[PDB]
Amino acid sequence: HHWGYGKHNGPEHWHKDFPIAKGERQSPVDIDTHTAKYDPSLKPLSVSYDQATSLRILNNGHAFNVEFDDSQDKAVLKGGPLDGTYRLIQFHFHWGSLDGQGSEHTVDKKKYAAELHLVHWNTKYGDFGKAVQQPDGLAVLGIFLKVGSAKPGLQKVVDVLDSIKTKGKSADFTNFDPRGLLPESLDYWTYPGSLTTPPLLECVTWIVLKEPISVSSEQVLKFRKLNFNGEGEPEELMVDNWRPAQPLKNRQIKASFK
Numbered sequence: 001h002h003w004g005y006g007k008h009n010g011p012e013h014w015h016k017d018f019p020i021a022k023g024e025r026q027s028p029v030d031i032d033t034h035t036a037k038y039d040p041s042l043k044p045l046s047v048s049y050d051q052a053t054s055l056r057i058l059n060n061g062h063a064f065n066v067e068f069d070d071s072q073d074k075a076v077l078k079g080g081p082l083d084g085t086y087r088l089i090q091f092h093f094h095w096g097s098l099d100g101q102g103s104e105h106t107v108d109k110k111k112y113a114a115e116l117h118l119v120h121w122n123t124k125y126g127d128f129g130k131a132v133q134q135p136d137g138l139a140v141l142g143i144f145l146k147v148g149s150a151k152p153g154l155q156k157v158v159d160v161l162d163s164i165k166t167k168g169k170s171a172d173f174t175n176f177d178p179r180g181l182l183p184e185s186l187d188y189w190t191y192p193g194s195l196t197t198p199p200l201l202e203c204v205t206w207i208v209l210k211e212p213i214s215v216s217s218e219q220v221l222k223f224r225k226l227n228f229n230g231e232g233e234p235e236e237l238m239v240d241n242w243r244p245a246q247p248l249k250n251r252q253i254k255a256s257f258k
């Protein structure tokens with residue numbers, strides 16, 4: 001009886017195995033745009049993905065991860081609220097069964113169709129496993145998806161999903177350029193939070209871009225054909241793999257923009 005996104009194992013049950021689920025800096029949160037304060041001391045984000053080396057795509061039973069070679073400073077995130085250098089390890093998405101839900105963060109209570117998470121770890125801690133034990137161990141760049149025009153840079157991801165339909169399946173996924181998933185603007189909100197799945201560790205500086213990317217209905221429909229289950233098991237579509245907004249508690253969300 002493992003955690004997931006069903007009625008008997010979903011987000012409202014996670015606290016039983018992971019008591020930090022009710023902690024002081026849990027994610028995601030609702031971003032109240034009128035309460036978020038412009039912080040003129042925040043720097044522009046530095047997203048340096050030109051040397052990114054993608055390796056593999058994996059259905060882990062909760063989402064799919066596009067994994068990168070993080071054994072050198074290839075693809076890194078710096079600046080903004082961050083001190084030091086954060087190395088890209090993987091990206092994944094959360095999405096809904098319908099276009100009106102799917103994102104983890106919300107903006108004035110608005111839910112987007114999906115949310116992209118580019119996960120980075122602070123290189124002062126040496127490895128990802130050590131980084132997640134630190135309050136400034138990870139930086140996750142979150143990007144909202146809305147349904148409209150297709151995102152050309154997403155299609156290579158979409159087209160490999162048939163080969164990783166079920167939990168535990170992976171496929172080679174080299175030479176994928178994550179720069180093709182970014183919006184035009186790097187304006188962002190930032191706050192201290194957590195992993196949004198178990199183990200829910202409070203180790204993340206969240207950087208959530210204001211500008212969503214547009215993906216087509218056909219692209220998101222292919223996300224929704226994935227399976228939570230393993231091969232040869234009863235089919236359960238991988239949809240609604242998002243955690244709802246958690247209490248903000250003693251936190252302030254800062255904006256990089258006026």
Ligand SMILES: NS(O)(O)c1ccc(-n2cc(COc3ccccc3)nn2)cc1
Nearest residue numbers: 117119129132140194195196197198199
């Ligand atoms: N959705 S998210 O907040 O971007 C998010 C990002 C990453 C994770 N996540 C969970 C795990 C699995 O937990 C680990 C704990 C210690 C060392 C290694 C792995 N590894 N990564 C969970 C959620």
Ligand SMILES: [Zn+2]
Nearest residue numbers: 092094117196
């Ligand atoms: Zn995520």
